[PDB]
Structures are given as structure tokens and as C-alpha cells.
Amino acid sequence: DSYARVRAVVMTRDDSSGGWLQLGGGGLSSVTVSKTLQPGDSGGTEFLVHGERLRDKTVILECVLRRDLVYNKVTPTFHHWRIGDKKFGLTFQSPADARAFDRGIRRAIEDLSQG
């Protein structure tokens, strides 16, 4: 149930400068856009962005997202979003990977059901 899976670098925003950093000093993570693990009795009103860093098998990105998502595309390899005041992003290895991930996000949003 993954709409897209890539290996990318999870990003976090420095609040003082506004510049972005590689979360935890970077390294590639396996990052998926998938259906929720807890749909309840609805088809599915939420989806999941999940990133597990490869070298140390650590989940460093876990976002429950909804139809309201604003998915910001800044460069061909850098995209970012928020949940409230919390900021998250990805640096992709290639423009094609970024396109795949963006298609995955769009697919997840388009398939979201009513609650």
C-alpha cells in the first residue's frame, strides 16, 4: 500500500535563520507515502509519510497527513510541508525521484475518502 517509495534525505527547518538542515545530519532514508495504519471504519481520511534512515534503522519522519496538505515544491529536488508549526521536508537524489514522490502525494490525496 505505498503510493511511492524513494530514498531521500529528511529535512528540518532552522527556526532562527529559516534555512533547512539535514535532520540528524542526514544519510539516506527510505521514505514512503502510504495509506494509514489506523483507518478506523472509514475508507481512509488520512495518509502517512514515513521515513526510516537506512544506516541506523531509525524512524526519523512520521507524518499523518490529510486532504488539507499544502505540498511545497521549491526546486526539482527539494520539497517541504508543515503540520501546524512543525516543518518537514525532503531532498531527493534526482528530479525523477521528486516527481515520483509528488505523484504519490497527489495519488494519496485523490484517494482520500469521507470520514
d(CA 40, CA 48): 14
d(CA 99, CA 72): 13
CATH classification at residue 76: 2.30.29.30
In SS3 terms, 31-97 reads as EEEEECCCCCCCCCCCEEEEEEECCCCEEEEEEEECCCCCCEEEECCEEEEEECCEEEEEEECCHHH
Question: What experimental approach yielded this model?
Answer: X-ray
Q: Strand, coil or helix: what is 30?
A: strand
d(CA 86, CA 84): 6
Return the C-alpha cell found at 36: 494509514
Range of the domain at 83: 1-115
Instruction: Report which residue type is found at 60.
Output: I
Characterize the bridge pairing of strands 20-22 and 2-13: antiparallel
| Burial label, 92 (beta-carbon count in 10 A; 0-12, 13-18, 19+) | buried
The reported resolution of this PDB entry, expressed in Å, is 1.6
DSSP 23: G
Beta bridge partners, 11, equal 22, 89
Nearest to 5 by CA among 40, 42, 41, 32: 32
**Count of domains observed in the chain:** 1
H/E stretch holding 1 reads none
